[PDB]
Coordinates of C-alpha atoms in Angstrom, one line a residue:
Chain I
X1 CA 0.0 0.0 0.0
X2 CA 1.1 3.8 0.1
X3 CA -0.3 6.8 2.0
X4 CA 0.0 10.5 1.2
X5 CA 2.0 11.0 3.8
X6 CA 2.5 15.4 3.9
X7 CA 6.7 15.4 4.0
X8 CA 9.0 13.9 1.6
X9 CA 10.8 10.8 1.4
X10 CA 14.2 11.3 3.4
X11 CA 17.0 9.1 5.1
X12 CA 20.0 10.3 7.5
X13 CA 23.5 10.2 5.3
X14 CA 24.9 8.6 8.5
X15 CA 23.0 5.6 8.4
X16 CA 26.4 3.0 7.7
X17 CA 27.8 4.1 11.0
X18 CA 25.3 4.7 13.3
X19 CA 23.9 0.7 12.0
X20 CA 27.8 -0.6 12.5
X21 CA 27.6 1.1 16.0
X22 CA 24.2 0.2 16.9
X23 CA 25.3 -3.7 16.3
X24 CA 27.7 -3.0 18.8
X25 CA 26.1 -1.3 21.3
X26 CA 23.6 -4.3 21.3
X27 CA 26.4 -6.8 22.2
X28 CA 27.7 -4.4 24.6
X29 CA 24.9 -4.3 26.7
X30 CA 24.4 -8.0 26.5
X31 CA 20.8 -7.8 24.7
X32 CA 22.1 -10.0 21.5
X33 CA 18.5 -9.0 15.0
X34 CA 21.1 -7.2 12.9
X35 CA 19.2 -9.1 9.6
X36 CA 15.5 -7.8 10.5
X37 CA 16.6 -4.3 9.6
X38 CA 14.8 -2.9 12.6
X39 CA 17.8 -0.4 13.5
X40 CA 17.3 1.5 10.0
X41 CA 14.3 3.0 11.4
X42 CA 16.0 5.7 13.6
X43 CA 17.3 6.9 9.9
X44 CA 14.3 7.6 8.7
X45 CA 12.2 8.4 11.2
X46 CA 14.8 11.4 12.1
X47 CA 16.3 12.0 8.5
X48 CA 18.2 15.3 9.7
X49 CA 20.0 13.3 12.4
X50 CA 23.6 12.8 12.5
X51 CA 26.8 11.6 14.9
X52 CA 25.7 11.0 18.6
X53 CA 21.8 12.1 17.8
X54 CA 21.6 9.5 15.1
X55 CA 23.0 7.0 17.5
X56 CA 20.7 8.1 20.7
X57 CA 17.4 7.2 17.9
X58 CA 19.1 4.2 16.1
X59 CA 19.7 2.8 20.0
X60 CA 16.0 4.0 22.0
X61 CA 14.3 2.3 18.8
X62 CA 16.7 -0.8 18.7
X63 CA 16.1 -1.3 22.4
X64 CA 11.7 -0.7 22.2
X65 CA 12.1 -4.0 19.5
X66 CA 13.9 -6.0 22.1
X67 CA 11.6 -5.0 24.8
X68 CA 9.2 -6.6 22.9
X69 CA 10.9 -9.7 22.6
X70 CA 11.3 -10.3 26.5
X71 CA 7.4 -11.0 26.2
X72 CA 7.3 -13.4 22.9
X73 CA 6.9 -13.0 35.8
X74 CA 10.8 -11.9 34.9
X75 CA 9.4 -9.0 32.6
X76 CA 6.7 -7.8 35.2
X77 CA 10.1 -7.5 36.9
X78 CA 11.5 -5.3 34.8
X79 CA 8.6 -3.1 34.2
X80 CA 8.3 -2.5 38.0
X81 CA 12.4 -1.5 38.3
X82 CA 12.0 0.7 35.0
X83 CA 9.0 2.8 36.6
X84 CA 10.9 3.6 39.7
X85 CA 14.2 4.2 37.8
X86 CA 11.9 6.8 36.0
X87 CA 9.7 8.3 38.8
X88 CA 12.5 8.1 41.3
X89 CA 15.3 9.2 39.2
X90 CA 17.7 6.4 40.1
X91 CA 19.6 4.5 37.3
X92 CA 21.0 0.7 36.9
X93 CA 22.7 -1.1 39.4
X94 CA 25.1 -4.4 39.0
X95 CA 21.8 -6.5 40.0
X96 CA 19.7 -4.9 37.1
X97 CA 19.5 -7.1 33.9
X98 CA 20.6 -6.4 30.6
X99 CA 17.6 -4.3 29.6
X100 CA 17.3 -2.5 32.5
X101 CA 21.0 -1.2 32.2
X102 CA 20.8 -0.8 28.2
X103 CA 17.4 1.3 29.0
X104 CA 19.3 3.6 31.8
X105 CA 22.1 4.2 29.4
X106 CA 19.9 5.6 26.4
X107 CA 17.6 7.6 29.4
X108 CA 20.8 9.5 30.4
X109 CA 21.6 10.8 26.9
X110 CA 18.1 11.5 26.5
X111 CA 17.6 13.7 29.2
X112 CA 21.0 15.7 28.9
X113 CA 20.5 19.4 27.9
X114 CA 16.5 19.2 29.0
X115 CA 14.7 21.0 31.1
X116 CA 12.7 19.6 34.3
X117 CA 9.2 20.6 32.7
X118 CA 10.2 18.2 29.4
X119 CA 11.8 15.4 31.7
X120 CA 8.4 15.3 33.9
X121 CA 6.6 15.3 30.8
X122 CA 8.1 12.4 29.5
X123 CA 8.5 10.3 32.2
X124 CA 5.1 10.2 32.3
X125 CA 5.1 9.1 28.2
X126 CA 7.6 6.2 29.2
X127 CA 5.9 5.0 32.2
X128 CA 2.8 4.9 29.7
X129 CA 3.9 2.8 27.4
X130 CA 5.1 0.0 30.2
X131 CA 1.7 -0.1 31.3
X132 CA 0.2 -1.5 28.0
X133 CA 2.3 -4.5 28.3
X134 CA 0.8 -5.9 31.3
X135 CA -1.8 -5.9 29.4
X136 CA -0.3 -7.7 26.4
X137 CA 0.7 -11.0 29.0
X138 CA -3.2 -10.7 30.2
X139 CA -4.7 -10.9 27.0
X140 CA -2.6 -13.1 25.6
X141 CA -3.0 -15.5 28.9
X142 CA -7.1 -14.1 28.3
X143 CA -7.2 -15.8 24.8
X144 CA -9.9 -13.4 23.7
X145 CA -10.6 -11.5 20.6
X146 CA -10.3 -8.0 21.5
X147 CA -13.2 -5.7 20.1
X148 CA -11.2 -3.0 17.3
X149 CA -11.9 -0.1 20.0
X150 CA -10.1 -2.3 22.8
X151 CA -7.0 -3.7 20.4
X152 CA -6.5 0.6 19.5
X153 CA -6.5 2.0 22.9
X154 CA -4.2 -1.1 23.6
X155 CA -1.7 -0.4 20.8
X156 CA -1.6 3.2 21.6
X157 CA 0.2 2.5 24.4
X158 CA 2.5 -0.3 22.8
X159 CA 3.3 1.7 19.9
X160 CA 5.6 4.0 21.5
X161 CA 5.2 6.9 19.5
X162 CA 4.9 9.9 22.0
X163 CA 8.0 9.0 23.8
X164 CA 9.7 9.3 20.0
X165 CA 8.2 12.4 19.7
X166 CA 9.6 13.8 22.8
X167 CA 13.1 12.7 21.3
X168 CA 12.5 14.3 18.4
X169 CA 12.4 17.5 20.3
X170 CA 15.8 16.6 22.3
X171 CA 17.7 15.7 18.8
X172 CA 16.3 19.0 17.3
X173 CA 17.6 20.7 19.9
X174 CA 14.4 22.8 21.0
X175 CA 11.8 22.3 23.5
X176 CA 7.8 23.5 22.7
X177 CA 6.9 25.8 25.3
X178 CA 4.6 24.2 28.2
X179 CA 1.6 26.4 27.2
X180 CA 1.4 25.0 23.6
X181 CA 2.5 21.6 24.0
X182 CA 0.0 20.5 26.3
X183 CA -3.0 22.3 24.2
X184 CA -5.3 20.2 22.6
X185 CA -4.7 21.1 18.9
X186 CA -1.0 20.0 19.1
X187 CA -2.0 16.5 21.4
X188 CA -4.3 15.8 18.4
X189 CA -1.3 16.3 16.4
X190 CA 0.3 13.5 18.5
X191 CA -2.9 11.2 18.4
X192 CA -3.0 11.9 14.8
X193 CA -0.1 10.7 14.0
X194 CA -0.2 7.5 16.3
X195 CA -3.5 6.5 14.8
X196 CA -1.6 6.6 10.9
X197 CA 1.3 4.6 12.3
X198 CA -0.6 2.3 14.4
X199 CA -2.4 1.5 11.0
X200 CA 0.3 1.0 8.6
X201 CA 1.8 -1.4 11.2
X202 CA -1.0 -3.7 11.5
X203 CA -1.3 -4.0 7.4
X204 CA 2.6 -4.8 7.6
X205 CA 2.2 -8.0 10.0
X206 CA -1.3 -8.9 9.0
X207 CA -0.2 -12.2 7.3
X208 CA 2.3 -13.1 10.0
X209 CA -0.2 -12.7 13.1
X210 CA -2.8 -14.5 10.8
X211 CA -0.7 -17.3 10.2
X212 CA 0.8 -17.2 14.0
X213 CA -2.7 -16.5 15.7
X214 CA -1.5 -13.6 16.9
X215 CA -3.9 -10.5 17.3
X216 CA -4.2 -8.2 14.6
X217 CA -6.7 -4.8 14.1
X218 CA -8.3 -6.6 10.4
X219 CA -8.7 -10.0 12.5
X220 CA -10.8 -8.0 15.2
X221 CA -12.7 -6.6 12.8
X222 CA -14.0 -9.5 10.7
X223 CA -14.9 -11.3 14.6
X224 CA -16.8 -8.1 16.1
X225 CA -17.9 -6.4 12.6
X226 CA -19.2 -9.4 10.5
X227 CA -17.0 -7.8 7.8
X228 CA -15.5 -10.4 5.0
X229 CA -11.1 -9.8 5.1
X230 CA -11.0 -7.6 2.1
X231 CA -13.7 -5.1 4.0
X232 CA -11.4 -5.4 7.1
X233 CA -8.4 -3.9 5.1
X234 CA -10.6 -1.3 3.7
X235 CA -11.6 -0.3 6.8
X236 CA -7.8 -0.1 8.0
X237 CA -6.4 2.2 5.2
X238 CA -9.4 4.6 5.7
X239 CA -8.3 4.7 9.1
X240 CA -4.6 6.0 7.9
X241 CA -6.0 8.1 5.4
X242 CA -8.5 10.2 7.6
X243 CA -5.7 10.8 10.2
X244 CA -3.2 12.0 7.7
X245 CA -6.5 14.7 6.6
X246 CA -7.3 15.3 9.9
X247 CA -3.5 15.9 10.9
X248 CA -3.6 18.1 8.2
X249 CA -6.8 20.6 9.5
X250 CA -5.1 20.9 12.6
X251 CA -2.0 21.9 11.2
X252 CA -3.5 24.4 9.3
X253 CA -4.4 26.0 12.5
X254 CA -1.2 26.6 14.0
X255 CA -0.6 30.4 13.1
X256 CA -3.7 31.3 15.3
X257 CA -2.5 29.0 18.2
X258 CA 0.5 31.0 18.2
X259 CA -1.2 34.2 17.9
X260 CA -3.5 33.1 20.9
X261 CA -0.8 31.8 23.1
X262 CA 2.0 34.1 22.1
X263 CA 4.1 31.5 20.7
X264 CA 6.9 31.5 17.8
X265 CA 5.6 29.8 15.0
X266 CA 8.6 29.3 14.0
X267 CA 9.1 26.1 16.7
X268 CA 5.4 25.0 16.2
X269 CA 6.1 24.0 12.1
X270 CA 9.6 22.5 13.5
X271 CA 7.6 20.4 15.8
X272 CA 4.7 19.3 13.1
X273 CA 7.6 19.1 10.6
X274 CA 9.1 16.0 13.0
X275 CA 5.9 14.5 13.2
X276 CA 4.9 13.9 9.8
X277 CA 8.8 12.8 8.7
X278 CA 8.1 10.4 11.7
X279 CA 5.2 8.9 9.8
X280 CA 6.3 9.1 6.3
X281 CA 9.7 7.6 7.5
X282 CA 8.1 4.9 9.0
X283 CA 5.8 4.2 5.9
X284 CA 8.8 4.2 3.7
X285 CA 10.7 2.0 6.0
X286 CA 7.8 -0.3 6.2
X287 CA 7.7 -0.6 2.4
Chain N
X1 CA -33.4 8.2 33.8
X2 CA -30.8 5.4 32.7
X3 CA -30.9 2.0 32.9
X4 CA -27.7 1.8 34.9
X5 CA -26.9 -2.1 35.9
X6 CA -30.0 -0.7 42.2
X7 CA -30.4 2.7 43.8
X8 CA -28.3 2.2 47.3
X9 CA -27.3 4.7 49.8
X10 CA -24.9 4.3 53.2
X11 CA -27.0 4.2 56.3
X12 CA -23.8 6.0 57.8
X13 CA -24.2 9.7 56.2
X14 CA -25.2 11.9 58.3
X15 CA -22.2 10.9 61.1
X16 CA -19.9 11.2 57.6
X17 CA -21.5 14.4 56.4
X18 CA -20.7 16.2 59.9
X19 CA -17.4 15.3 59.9
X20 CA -16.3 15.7 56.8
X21 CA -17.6 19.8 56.9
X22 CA -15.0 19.9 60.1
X23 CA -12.7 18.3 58.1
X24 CA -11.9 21.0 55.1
X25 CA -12.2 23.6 58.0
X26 CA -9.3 21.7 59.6
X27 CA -7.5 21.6 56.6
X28 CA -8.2 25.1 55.5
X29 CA -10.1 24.5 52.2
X30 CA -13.0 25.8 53.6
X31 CA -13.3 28.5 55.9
X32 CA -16.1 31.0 57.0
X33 CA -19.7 30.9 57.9
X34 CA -20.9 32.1 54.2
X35 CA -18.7 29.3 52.2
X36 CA -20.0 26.2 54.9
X37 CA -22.8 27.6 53.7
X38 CA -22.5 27.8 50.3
X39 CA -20.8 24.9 50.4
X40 CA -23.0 22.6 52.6
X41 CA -25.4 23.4 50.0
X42 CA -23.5 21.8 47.1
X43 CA -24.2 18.4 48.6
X44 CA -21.1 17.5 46.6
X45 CA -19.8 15.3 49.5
X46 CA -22.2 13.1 49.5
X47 CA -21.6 11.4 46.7
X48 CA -19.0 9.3 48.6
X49 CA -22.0 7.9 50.3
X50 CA -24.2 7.5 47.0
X51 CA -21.1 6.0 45.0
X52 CA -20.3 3.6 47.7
X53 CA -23.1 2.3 49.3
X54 CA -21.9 -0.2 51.2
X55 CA -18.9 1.9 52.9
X56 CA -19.1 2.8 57.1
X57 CA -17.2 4.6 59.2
X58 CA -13.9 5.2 58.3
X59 CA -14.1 3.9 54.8
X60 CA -16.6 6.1 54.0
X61 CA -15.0 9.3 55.4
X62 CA -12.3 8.6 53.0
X63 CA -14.7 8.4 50.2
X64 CA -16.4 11.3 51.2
X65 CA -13.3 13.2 51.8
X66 CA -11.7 12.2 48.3
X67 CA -14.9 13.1 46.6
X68 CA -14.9 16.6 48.4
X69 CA -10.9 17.4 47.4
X70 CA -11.9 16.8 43.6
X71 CA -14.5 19.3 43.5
X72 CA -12.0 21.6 45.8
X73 CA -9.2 21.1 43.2
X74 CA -11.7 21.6 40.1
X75 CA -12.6 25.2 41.9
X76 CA -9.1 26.2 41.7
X77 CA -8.9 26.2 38.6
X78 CA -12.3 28.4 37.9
X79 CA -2.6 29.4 36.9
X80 CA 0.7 30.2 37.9
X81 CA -0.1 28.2 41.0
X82 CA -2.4 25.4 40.0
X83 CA 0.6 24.3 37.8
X84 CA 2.6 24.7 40.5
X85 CA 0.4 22.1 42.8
X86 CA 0.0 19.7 39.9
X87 CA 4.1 19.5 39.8
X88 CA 3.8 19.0 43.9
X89 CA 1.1 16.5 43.8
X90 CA 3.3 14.4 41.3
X91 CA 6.6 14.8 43.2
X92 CA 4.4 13.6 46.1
X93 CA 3.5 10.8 44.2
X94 CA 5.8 9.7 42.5
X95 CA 8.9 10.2 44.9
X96 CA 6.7 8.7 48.2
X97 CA 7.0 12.2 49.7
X98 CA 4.4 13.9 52.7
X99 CA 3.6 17.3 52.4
X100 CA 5.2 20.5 54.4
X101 CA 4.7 23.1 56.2
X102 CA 5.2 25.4 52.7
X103 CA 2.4 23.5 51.1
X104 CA -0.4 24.9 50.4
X105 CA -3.5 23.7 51.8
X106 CA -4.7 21.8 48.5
X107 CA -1.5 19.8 49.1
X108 CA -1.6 19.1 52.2
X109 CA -5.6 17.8 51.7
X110 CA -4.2 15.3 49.5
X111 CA -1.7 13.7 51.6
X112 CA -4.1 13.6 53.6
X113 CA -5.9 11.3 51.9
X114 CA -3.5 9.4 50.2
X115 CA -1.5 8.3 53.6
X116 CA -5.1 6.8 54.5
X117 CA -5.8 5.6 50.7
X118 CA -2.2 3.5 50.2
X119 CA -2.8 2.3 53.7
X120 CA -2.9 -2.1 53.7
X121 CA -2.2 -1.9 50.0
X122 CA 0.2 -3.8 48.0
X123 CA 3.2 -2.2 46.0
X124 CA 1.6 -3.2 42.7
X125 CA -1.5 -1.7 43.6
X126 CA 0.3 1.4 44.8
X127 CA 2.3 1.5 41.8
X128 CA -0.6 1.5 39.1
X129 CA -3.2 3.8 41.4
X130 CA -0.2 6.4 41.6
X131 CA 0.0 6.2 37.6
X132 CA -3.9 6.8 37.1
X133 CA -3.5 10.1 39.9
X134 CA -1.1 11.5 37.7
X135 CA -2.6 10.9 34.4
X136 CA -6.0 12.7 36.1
X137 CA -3.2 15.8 37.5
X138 CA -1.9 15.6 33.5
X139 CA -4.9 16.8 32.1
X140 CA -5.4 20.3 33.9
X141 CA -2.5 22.2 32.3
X142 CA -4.7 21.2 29.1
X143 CA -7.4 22.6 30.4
X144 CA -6.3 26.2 31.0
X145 CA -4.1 26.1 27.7
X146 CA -7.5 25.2 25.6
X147 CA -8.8 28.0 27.6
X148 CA -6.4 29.9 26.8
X149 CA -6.5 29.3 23.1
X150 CA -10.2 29.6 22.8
X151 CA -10.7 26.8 20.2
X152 CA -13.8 25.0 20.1
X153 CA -12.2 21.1 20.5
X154 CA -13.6 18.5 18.2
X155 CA -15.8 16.1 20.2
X156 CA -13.3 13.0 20.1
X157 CA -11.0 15.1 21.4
X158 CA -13.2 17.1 24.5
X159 CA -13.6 13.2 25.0
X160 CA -10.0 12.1 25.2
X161 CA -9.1 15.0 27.6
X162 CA -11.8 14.4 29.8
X163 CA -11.0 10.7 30.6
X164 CA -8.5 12.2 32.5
X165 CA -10.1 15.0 34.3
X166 CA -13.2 12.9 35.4
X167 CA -11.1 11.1 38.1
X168 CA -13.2 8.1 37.6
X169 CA -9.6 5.7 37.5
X170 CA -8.9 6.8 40.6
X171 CA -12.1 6.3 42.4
X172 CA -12.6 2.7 41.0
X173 CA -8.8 2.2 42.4
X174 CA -10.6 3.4 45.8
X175 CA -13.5 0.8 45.7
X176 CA -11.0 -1.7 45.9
X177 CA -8.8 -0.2 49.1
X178 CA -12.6 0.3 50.6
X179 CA -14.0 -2.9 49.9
X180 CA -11.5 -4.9 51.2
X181 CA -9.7 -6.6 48.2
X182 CA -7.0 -6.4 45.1
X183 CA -8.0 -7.3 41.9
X184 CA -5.4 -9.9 40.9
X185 CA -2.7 -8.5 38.9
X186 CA -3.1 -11.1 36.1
X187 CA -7.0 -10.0 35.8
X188 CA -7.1 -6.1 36.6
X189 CA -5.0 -5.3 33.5
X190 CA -7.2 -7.5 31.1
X191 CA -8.6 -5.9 28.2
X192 CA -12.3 -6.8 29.9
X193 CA -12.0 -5.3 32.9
X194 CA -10.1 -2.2 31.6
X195 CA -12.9 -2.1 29.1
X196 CA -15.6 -2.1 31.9
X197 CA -14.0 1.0 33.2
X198 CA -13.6 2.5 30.3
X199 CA -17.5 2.1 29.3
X200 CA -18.1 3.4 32.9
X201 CA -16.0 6.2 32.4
X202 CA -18.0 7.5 29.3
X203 CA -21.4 6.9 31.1
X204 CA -20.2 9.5 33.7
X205 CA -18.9 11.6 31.2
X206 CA -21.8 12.0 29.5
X207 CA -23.9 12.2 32.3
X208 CA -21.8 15.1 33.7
X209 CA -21.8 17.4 30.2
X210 CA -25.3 17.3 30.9
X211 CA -25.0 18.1 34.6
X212 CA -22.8 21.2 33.6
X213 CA -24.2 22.1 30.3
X214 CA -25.5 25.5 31.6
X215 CA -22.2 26.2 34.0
X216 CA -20.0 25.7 31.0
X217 CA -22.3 27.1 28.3
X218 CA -21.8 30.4 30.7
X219 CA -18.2 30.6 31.7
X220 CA -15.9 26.2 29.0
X221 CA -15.9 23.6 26.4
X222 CA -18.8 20.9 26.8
X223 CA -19.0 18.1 24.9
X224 CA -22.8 19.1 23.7
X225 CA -20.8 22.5 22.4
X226 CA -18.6 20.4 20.3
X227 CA -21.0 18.7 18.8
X228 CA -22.8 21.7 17.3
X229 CA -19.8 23.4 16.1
X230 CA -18.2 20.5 14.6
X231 CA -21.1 18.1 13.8
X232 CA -23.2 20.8 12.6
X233 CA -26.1 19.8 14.7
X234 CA -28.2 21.6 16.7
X235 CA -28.6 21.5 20.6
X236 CA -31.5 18.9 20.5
X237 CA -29.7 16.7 18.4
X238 CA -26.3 16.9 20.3
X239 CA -27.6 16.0 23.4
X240 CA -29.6 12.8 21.8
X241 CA -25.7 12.4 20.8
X242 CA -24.7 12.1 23.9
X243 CA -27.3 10.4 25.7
X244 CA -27.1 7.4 23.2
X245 CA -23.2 7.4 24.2
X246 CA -24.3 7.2 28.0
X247 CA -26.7 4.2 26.9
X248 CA -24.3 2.5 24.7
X249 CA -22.0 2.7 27.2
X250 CA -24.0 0.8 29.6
X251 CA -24.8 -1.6 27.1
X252 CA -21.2 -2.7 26.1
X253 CA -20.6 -3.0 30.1
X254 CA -23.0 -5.4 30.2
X255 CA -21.9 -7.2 27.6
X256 CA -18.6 -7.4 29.2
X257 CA -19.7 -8.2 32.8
X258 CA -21.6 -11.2 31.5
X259 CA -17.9 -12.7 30.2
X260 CA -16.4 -12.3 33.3
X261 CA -17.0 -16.5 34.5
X262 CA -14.8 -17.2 31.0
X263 CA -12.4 -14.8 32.4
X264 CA -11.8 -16.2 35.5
X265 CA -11.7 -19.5 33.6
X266 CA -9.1 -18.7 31.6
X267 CA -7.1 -16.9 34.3
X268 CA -7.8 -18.9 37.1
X269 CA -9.5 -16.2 39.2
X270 CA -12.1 -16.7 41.8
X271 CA -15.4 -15.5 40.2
X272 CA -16.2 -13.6 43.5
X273 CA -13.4 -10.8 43.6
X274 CA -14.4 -10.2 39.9
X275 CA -18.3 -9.6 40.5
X276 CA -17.6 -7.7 43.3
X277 CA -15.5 -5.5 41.1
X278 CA -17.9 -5.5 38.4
X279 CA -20.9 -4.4 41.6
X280 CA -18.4 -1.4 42.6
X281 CA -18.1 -0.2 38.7
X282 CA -21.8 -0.2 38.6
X283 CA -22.8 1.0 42.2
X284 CA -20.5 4.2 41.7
X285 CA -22.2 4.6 37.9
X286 CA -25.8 4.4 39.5
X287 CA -24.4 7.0 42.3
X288 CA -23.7 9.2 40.4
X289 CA -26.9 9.5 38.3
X290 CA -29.5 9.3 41.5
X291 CA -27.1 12.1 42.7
X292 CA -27.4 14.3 40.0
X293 CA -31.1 14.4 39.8

């Protein structure tokens, strides 16, 4: 399939080190993959990123893939010491395991340089998206078909999207000011955008999860909808296509939030700029 | 008049009500003959007794006095400051922290509450009941910046941000520390159980836009407003909007409660925690409605 995504097809020149290093890094920390191409994505999600930056995305999108892994009592484990570490501001100790220390290490870099507004922020967004994956272990235990309302409000957690979007801002180098970050014209930007990517994913591993029993959005809607599978994937690219317009209309209105709130508009397109080359990076990547 | 899954009220009230009026006095949320007053007439206490019938004594001056500190936190916001409690709150809450002698009384309400609300519950429970009161304090510095920028919010999205100023996470968190059990970990993060308080959630929602329809009409968003501006519908049809979301709502809870034997099946849960759980859900729904007529 392809979306018209609003931003243009773009990868990172740095991509051949920051992969070599990433490979690395991985065996470092005692996670280790390299052949599922998985690491590319922080090139194309964050196309303008090079050096250390490149290496902070390529590593905090490398580590949410193996994360997944430690679920396909022990991870309940880790999502307990990873919520302190966050709330309480602590960091890895010699008992922690691998992930736990690999985490630490990309949270440092990530909060260098930011201010204690944008760290509360997004502790918050991290502490988020471990609490989706109790749920995944429950369901899975469950054994149920999840209605397509449930399996959404589920995978907007797992997706991980708004913690990227806060690293977007510390790779940029800019921080959008409390006031207009928190409105609800630029958090619709944020669901927006989740709702597009959360799409394209689950028309990338339909045929796996079908063929794995594994859940998938088109599967819930055939159960609960009575819809036949090629109205199912209808259904799914409208869903991507009426975010990308509806990300659009909001967009349009940033000028007058800036007016209103007495922001530079200036940061507000660099911010909705790093959202949609988000998306279209992960379409292309997905492709 | 809903359908809500009976009408039940605590024999204890008027010991609770008494109390709890000393109780923001003490606390210095409520001071003066003219705002008792004003204040006694509100009758917004007593919903702890209405959404938790069964609650006595000390359980329910908890409920009562949780209930109270909402609507006391809501008031304040009716800037500089109430961003500076939300950052306090979560400190509080996330570093295990009691208030000072520098807080302000708002603060130190809360503590209050929460030293008596973690009290004989586990570290797990602790840990995701601190996450839902910080996701409720995250939605307030949305509040005054869509006030600020004086859009009229789509209805999906008045929706969104009001699943976290409604509190109703952390009051269903509450009904377990007052009834006298823990959901089993396994269980309470199932997609049917967080689905039953998600469809709970929206029947109170709605119910409330229509409580406040006037209040915000004359100050706000409202969901009702949305759905003129954006829908293009007029107010009678809005409000048939919402109402069919508040019976909807109750239908696809019902439809969920009656899969909670397969559930505990599957899990290996006793049946009994999980109908109790599904009775509090309900009991603080119907509450909340027989309240607010």
């Amino acid at each position: 399939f392809e979306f018209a995504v609003p931003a243009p097809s773009r990868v990172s020149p740095d991509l051949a080190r920051a992969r070599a290093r990433h490979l690395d890094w991985v065996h470092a920390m005692d996670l280790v993959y390299e052949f599922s191409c998985v690491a590319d994505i922080g090139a194309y999600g964050y196309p303008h990123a090079t050096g250390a930056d490149l290496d902070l995305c390529v590593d905090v999108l490398g580590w949410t893939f193996l994360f997944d892994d430690q679920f396909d009592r022990d991870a309940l484990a880790v999502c307990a010491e990873l919520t302190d570490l966050l709330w309480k501001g602590t960091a890895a100790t010699a008992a922690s395991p691998p992930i736990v220390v690999a985490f630490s290490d990309c949270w440092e870099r990530m909060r260098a340089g930011m201010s204690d507004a944008w760290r509360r922020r997004t502790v918050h967004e991290w502490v988020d998206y471990l609490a989706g994956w109790p749920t995944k272990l429950a369901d899975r235990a469950h054994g149920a078909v999840l209605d397509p309302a449930a399996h959404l409000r589920a995978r907007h957690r797992t997706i991980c999207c708004r913690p990227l979007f806060a690293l977007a801002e510390r790779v940029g180098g800019y921080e959008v000011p409390r006031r207009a970050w928190h409105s609800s014209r630029l958090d619709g930007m944020r669901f927006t955008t989740s709702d597009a990517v959360i799409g394209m994913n689950e028309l990338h591993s339909f045929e796996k999860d079908r063929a794995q029993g594994h859940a998938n959005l088109v599967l819930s809607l055939v159960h609960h909808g009575g819809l036949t599978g090629p109205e199912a994937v209808t259904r799914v690219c409208d869903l991507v296509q009426g975010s990308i317009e509806s990300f659009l209309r909001l967009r349009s209105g940033l000028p007058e939030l800036g007016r209103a709130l007495g922001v530079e508009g200036a940061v507000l397109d660099r911010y909705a700029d790093a959202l949609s080359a988000f998306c279209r990076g992960y379409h292309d990547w997905g492709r």
